[PDB]
Design a protein around this ligand. Structure first.
Ligand code: THP
Ligand code: CA
Length: 129
């Protein structure tokens, strides 16, 4: 797996973000996570967390997995990094997201995020409190 460049177009919510990728605008859905929707509990906090993360990054990178790169709604499915730190993992670590939608062949970073979730549960963080 490798990191490709992209630029913020627009923060959207806890687990979707608009990026420019290979010069095209495109909504990305964060692999292996599920944030609450904005209208749910911690939805707003999730959105703010990612928003802050991507808006403050000097460098956004996109990392496809080995499988499907687009979902059925046309969203790009990737791991997204903000100055080297993975947003997907960061959300889970803070208990702003659950590990979720784990499909085979698009699950490289699965155990890494389960480690993170386990620590967030342990600390009773946000979702787990
Ligand atoms: C995370 C992810 C979601 N999806 C699809 C499955 C879900 O289908 P349904 O809409 O049929 O429930 C939907 C959930 O995304 P959201 O959590 O953004 O709604 O996105 C994938 O197909 N692959 C993925 O990796
Ligand atoms: Ca969601």
């Amino acid at each position: 797996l490798h990191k490709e460049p992209a630029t913020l177009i627009k923060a959207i919510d806890g687990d979707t973000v608009k990026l420019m990728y290979k010069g095209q605008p495109m909504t990305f859905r964060l692999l292996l996570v599920d944030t609450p929707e904005f209208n749910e509990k911690y939805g707003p906090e999730a959105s703010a967390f990612v928003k802050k993360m991507v808006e403050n990054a000097k460098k956004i990178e996109v990392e496809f997995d080995k499988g499907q790169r687009t979902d059925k709604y046309g969203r790009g499915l990737a791991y997204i990094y903000a100055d080297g730190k993975m947003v997907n993992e960061a959300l889970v670590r803070q208990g702003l997201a659950k590990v979720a939608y784990v499909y085979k062949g698009n699950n490289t970073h699965e155990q890494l995020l389960r480690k993170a979730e386990a620590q967030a549960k342990k600390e009773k963080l946000n979702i787990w409190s």
